[PDB]
Write a protein that binds this ligand. Structure first.
Ligand SMILES: [Zn+2]
Lengths: 63, 206, 67, 103, 37, 317, 127
RNA sequence: UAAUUGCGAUAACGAACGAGACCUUAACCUACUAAAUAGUGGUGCUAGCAUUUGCUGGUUAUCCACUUCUUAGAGGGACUA
């Protein structure tokens, strides 16, 4: 199974109608040349570590 | 181990177990294994406690929560149903019983079994109910490691309590049962079920 | 917001305006100095003023102020 | 030869301590044997009072307070010293009590 | 009744004072009850 | 050919400013330090290039910050002057307060005991220079300062105490004063300072006075002649002065660093400024106290970052 | 006059006074041994100041403990804190300083409440 | 800027009361200055069990010292350092 490892490097803020999901810029761990735009449902800090499945998916803005 | 005789002497089994560098009476934290890098620093428990009963004031800082013992954390997440609220002695004894079962379940390291359960039962990616205009579709998010561990311990304790209700089995046996069906995920546990379904609807919704 | 009431800011302004010499970066000496130079009716408000003259004293050693 | 125990009760600590230090120094400056002004715990009598006067708005609550302080001094003196000291020390706010027995 | 304003109602019958709450709140400062907290 | 001071490491165990230092003669391994953590620490030093071994004792007993301290010539007692309007006499061994000196009406800023350890002077912020026995009894009340009394010192006799018992004080009324404690009266009025005098010290022989303060003017007087000598410009504020036991050096504690002057031949020997990590230049810790060792080879310095930094004299090419 | 050292210990309005004197080596809370505590689970907590620095440190001192206020847990924490405190204070006044400081180092390394009381005082209900 | 709270620009420049603030409270003080109407330790009188020191008590005055715990204060303390 494809377990992608992520590294929350930059916190962008909070989105969603409810205002809960964090917009986050991710430095890929295994291949450090990939920087993904990811959404997180949970409390995140800087230099964190996520576990994604589709590293080629990006997220502009949330309603 | 060089024993010491006082006037009122400490029982020999205590002295022996703790001067043999054993952190409980039947277990040790020096043998604990984490699989992902995301769980390493959010599950971390390297201080030996004999009771899994700490006056933790970690509810004052959000990340500070991740430095409170995971066995004490699963212990306080046992205490969920409204009738058992405000009873930590019950949960601690029950966890000690569970550990007495995972040993006699042909598993040499109950602590690594639990940690591997926590590693296996935390959902990688999830969904959120984002607007989209009335008919709210579900955006595939990627849940945090902190909430991964949270949701893990949650699904575990809840599945186990939901199983141990209205059946003769004691809570420790369905908690060991859950933690072992989830230690190495078998799709016979509640937590692996729900994790796989959350990641499945997260997959279908992207 | 811990915004210092106008009495503290004004008294800091004046105290540094005529007594720049004897004040340093330290609150502990600015305090007893605020006891020996001024007559403040309370210890709390004197700690207020002397502490703000401490912060301001830390701001004037770097550049020229509007005073 | 009378061995007497005195007990003060007051809400204002300044008047109570005025009377206490007065009796202390006045009792030692004419040579008497005494146990110094022992200080009983200040009992804080509180009264819970509803915020709602007129039945408008939800029910939230409040509290009133009183601080009551009590002291005691033990002495040995004749009849005249006790009479005179009791007459001279009378103050408002402070309530003095003179007991003679030791049982 | 409240020994101040002819009121059967509001009576603080405690400690033998028997003032209704409205009048007792006013006479509170003259009795000895003051606002601390 | 130079005589170089080298940073030998750091002594840290305080929570507040190291406001005073005092060395010993009986045991040159002992250092007493009074701080703004309301405690005094006595150290037994093991001199290595980075760290110094054992921190012996703590002396908790002062309600407010401890300002000044002094040891005895054997190293058995301590004398601490605090902001709690009191002084104390400790045992450097156990920490036992042998006596509490209670008399002042404000913060005691300085203390020093005489040569034979029998007369204890004290200067405070209530413009009072009190003189006590070793039993806690005030036998003198020397008033005269119209502002603060920042420092009181006993001058080292040279004629083996030939009935002349003199003490020198530095007021914030911009004056130095010399008292004769044989009849308890003023003996000399040293006028010349333009701002607040922060410190003063008497030379080893007992004929020189060094007083400096906020003006940055290290003024030298002759006390045996009772006449003004001269003035050396130390630019920034000087908090503490001290004369070397052997050499003719004068190390001052300036708001920038630690300026070591020479008096014969006349030149600035050194300007000691230790490297600070992560601070602005208007945020760098300064020297608030300094003590010379028993042989003039070691210079201890109590700083404002709660750390006692030490220097040692070598000889260069 | 046997060399004695008295140190208290507080947890949530439960205090334990600990009298560490020089004896054969006996440890007792409320005239009963430390082996038999009321809570059987919290037991090991009252052991943790005895194990964290070695079991021999007690061969020279007889330790007393009396507990008032609180419940069972509050008083368990009270007596383990009173024990640790009494130990490092007897070692401060009687034994040398380095032993006492290695003892407070051993104590602080694991539980920083063994030497400092609980700083979560009961909240004023705020009317 | 939490604020019509200020800095600044300016046919506007003052000045008053609003806001704050005055007031009453909390948590640290092995440092003060102080105790049979609170308590601890030591000592005697005394009980039991072990006896090798020990263990658990009784004695509102047999005396002594303490306030480390309880308690009246004074200080301090914070000033967004
Ligand atoms: Zn009425």
């Amino acid at each position: 199974t494809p377990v992608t490892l992520a590294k929350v490097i930059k916190v962008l803020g909070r989105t969603g109608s409810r205002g809960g999901v964090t917009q986050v810029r991710v430095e890929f761990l295994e291949d450090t040349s990939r920087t993904i735009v990811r959404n997180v449902k949970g409390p995140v800090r800087e230099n964190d570590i996520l576990v994604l499945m589709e590293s080629e998916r990006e997220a502009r803005r949330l309603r | 181990f060089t024993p010491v005789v006082l006037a009122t002497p400490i029982p020999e089994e205590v002295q022996q177990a703790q001067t043999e560098i054993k952190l409980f009476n039947k277990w040790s934290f020096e043998e604990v294994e984490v699989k992902d890098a995301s769980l390493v620093d959010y599950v971390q428990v390297r201080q030996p406690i004999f009771v899994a009963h700490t006056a933790g004031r970690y509810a004052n800082k959000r990340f500070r929560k991740a430095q409170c013992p995971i066995i004490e954390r699963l212990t306080n997440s046992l205490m969920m149903n409204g009738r058992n609220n405000g009873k930590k002695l019950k949960a601690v004894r029950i966890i000690k019983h569970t550990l007495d079962i995972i040993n006699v379940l042909t598993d040499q390291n109950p602590i690594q079994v639990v940690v591997d359960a926590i590693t296996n039962t935390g959902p990688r990616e999830d969904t959120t109910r984002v607007g989209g205009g009335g008919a709210a579709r579900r955006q595939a998010v990627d849940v945090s490691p902190l909430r991964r561990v949270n949701q893990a311990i949650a699904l575990l304790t809840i599945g186990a309590r939901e199983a141990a209700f209205r059946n003769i089995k004691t809570i420790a046996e369905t908690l060991a049962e859950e933690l072992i069906n989830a230690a190495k995920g078998s799709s016979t546990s509640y937590a692996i079920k729900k994790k796989d379904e959350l990641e499945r609807v997260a997959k279908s919704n992207r | 917001g811990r915004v210092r009431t106008k009495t503290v800011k004004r008294a800091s302004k004046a105290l540094i305006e005529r007594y720049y010499p004897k004040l340093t970066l330290d609150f502990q000496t600015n305090k007893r100095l605020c006891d020996e130079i001024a007559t403040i009716q309370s210890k709390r408000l004197r700690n207020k003023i002397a502490g703000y003259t401490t912060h301001l004293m830390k701001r004037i050693q770097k550049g020229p102020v509007r005073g | 030869i009378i061995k007497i125990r005195i007990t003060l009760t007051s809400t204002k600590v300044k008047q109570l301590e005025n009377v206490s230090s007065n009796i202390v120094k006045n009792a030692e400056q004419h040579n008497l044997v005494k146990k110094g002004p022992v200080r009983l715990p200040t009992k804080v009598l509180k009264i819970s009072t509803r915020k709602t006067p007129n039945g408008e708005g939800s029910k939230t609550w409040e509290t009133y307070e009183m601080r009551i302080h009590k002291r005691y001094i033990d002495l040995e003196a004749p009849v005249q010293i006790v009479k005179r000291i009791t007459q001279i020390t009378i103050e408002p706010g402070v309530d003095v009590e003179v007991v003679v027995a030791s049982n | 009744q409240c020994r101040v304003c002819s009121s059967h109602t509001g009576l603080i019958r405690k400690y033998g004072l028997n003032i209704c709450r409205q009048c007792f709140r006013e006479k509170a400062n003259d009795i000895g009850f003051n606002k601390f907290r | 050919s130079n005589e170089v001071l080298v940073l030998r490491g750091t002594l840290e165990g305080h929570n507040g400013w190291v406001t005073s230092l005092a060395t010993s003669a009986g045991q040159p391994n002992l250092l007493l330090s009074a701080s703004r953590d309301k405690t005094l620490i006595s150290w037994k030093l093991t001199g290595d290039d980075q760290k110094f071994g054992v921190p012996v004792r703590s002396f908790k007993g002062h309600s407010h910050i401890v300002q000044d301290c002094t040891l005895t010539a054997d190293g058995a007692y301590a004398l601490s002057a605090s902001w709690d309007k009191t002084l104390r006499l400790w045992d450097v061994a156990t920490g036992e307060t042998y006596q509490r000196f209670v008399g002042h009406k404000s913060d005691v800023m300085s203390v020093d005991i005489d040569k034979k350890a029998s007369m204890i002077i004290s200067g405070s912020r209530d413009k009072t220079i009190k003189v006590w026995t070793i039993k806690g009894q005030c036998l003198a009340t020397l008033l005269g300062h119209n502002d603060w009394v920042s420092q009181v010192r006993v001058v080292p006799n040279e004629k083996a105490d030939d009935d002349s018992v003199t003490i020198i004080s530095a007021g914030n009324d911009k004056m130095v004063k010399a008292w004769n404690l044989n009849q308890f009266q003023i003996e000399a009025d040293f006028i010349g300072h333009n701002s607040n005098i922060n410190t003063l010290t008497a030379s080893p022989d007992g004929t020189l006075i060094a007083s400096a303060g906020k003006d940055g003017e290290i003024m030298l007087w002759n006390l045996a002649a009772k006449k003004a000598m001269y003035t050396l410009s130390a630019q920034d504020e000087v908090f503490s002065l001290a004369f070397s036991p052997n050499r003719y050096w004068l190390a001052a504690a300036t708001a920038t660093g630690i300026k070591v002057f020479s008096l014969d031949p006349q030149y600035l020997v050194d300007d000691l400024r230790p490297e600070f990590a992560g601070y602005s230049k208007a945020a760098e810790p300064h020297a608030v106290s300094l003590a010379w060792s028993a042989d003039g080879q070691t210079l201890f310095a109590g700083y404002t970052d709660n750390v006692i930094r030490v220097w040692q004299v070598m000889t260069a090419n | 006059a046997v060399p004695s050292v008295q140190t208290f210990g507080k947890k949530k309005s439960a205090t334990a006074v600990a009298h560490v004197k020089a004896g054969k080596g006996l440890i007792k809370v409320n005239g009963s041994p430390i082996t038999l505590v009321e809570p059987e689970i919290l037991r090991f907590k009252v052991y943790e100041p005895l194990l964290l620095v070695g079991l021999d440190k007690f061969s020279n001192i007889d330790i007393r403990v009396r507990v008032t206020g609180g419940g069972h847990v509050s008083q368990v924490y009270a007596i383990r804190q009173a024990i640790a405190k009494g130990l490092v204070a007897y070692h401060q006044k009687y034994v040398d300083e380095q032993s006492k400081n290695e003892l407070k180092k051993a104590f602080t390394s694991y539980d920083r409440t063994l030497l400092i009381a609980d700083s979560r005082r009961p909240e004023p209900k705020k009317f």
